[PDB]
A = this chain, B = another copy of it.
């Protein structure tokens, strides 16, 4: 990672590594969910899962990395069309991809789509994530 230069109000970076990146178009990243997981902050289950909302966060950070690679602060302003198909468990490798839809500096708004996979299966889809101004 060379992404500390990447902003996130959420304490933890949910992308272990970017394994593919095409400026102004798409980005692919990974996260091998462990039994460790700082996010269930010393608090956890009999069956500890990765909350859907954090899957959104991981996709947003990934998307944030792509924008960053296209004096350019981006805040997560909105998200639409998110669908959680299957839960994400420890031992799962969450593969994520974010595709740039638009970037109008006119208003300073970027829209990206996102998908999350586990063993070849879609676990989450995100129609659009919005970013902007600062």
Give chain A interface residues in 36-58, CB to chain B under 8 Å: 38-45, 49-54, 56-57
Q: Tell me the smallest distance from the CB of A20 to a CB of chain B, in Å.
A: 24
In this assembly, does A16 line the interface, its C-beta being within 8 Å of a C-beta of chain B? no
In this assembly, does A84 line the interface, its C-beta being within 8 Å of a C-beta of chain B? yes
If A38-B43, A78-B84 are given as contacts, then 12 extra A-B residue pairs at C-beta distance below 8 Å, sorted by A number, are A9-B49, A9-B51, A9-B52, A10-B39, A11-B41, A11-B45, A12-B41, A41-B41, A53-B54, A53-B76, A77-B83, A80-B80
**25 sample A-B contacts, Cβ–Cβ < 8 Å, listed by A number:** A9-B49, A9-B50, A9-B51, A9-B52, A10-B39, A11-B39, A11-B41, A11-B42, A11-B45, A12-B41, A38-B42, A38-B43, A41-B42, A52-B76, A53-B54, A53-B56, A53-B57, A56-B56, A77-B83, A78-B81, A78-B84, A80-B80, A80-B81, A80-B82, A80-B127
